[PDB]
Amino acid sequence: NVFQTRAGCLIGAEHVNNSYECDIPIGAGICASYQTSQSIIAYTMSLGAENSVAYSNNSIAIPTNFTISVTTEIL
């Protein structure tokens, strides 16, 4: 019921072996969030899915259809 960080001591949250995006930052890559019956979990920050490209000295990948998109940006 008590977790220990390289950033400090945490009370009232559960360490989880899983990994997720950072909902609330803590420190040293530990982030806390509220989730499933439900409680507060804290865990190692995740950095997106690990992906590998199939490189090879004679292999290329070419798009064949395309998507327009519209993204906001505020200043």
Binding site: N57, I62, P63, T64, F66, T67, V70, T72, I74, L75
Partner: protein
């Protein structure tokens, strides 16, 4: 097809703005800060700073001047400090906004009145155009960006040679569906027959690494054949 995507693209923005508040964090932020800046400035007026009261009219009403200056001076040096802290804060924050402003202006110039190639200076992906919109104390852009979607593996080769002479592409690369060989442009598969209009001779086979034997088509020979 592009039309519907663009039309569909805009529509999702309305939803992306109608429901969630987090999108306008930045503008809604700077307004919040100044509120605290003001409130903290206003709240200071009630601090006594060590004098016997906080009301300047009271301290006068209760004392004749000669020791009032002992009291009032305590307020003056108190509040007078409180301003220049607030001012310096505003000055510091002032610079940040302008840094955003000049970035905005440039991000308006290079991204609206033109078309940039500075990747991720106009939203993720290749940039096509951009539309601005008004906003309280700020501006909101709408980058319209092209993004490749559906991809396919292909067996490529940097160069092909046909008569000893090596042939390279003019625009695009060489790909093969496994059986035939095609040259195609480099951002949208569109196989074209490999021909002397697409290529240009240089050197000979045995120097370039990884060249493949093949045959380049000639437009003229069939014409001459007639």
């Amino acid at each position: 097809l592009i039309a519907n995507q663009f039309n569909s693209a805009i529509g999702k923005i309305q939803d992306s703005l109608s429901s969630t508040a987090s999108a306008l964090g930045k503008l809604q932020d700077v307004v919040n800060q100044n509120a605290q800046a003001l409130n903290t400035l206003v709240k200071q007026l009630s601090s006594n700073f060590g004098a016997i009261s906080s009301v300047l009219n009271d301290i006068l009403s209760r004392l004749d001047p000669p020791e009032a200056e002992v009291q009032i001076d305590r307020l003056i040096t108190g509040r007078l400090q409180s301003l220049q802290t607030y001012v310096t804060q505003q000055l510091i924050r002032a610079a940040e906004i302008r840094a955003s402003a000049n970035l905005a202006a440039t991000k308006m110039s290079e991204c609206v009145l033109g078309q940039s190639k500075r990747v991720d200076f106009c939203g993720k992906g290749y940039h096509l155009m951009s539309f601005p919109q008004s906003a309280p104390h700020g501006v909101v852009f709408l980058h319209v960006t092209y993004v490749p979607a559906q991809e396919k593996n292909f067996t490529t080769a940097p160069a092909i040679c046909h008569d000893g002479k090596a042939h390279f592409p003019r625009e695009g690369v060489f790909v093969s569906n496994g059986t035939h060989w095609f040259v195609t442009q480099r951002n949208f598969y569109e196989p074209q027959i490999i021909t002397t209009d697409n290529t240009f001779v240089s050197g000979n086979c045995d120097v370039v690494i990884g060249i493949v034997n093949n045959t380049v088509y000639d437009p003229l020979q069939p014409e001459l054949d007639s």
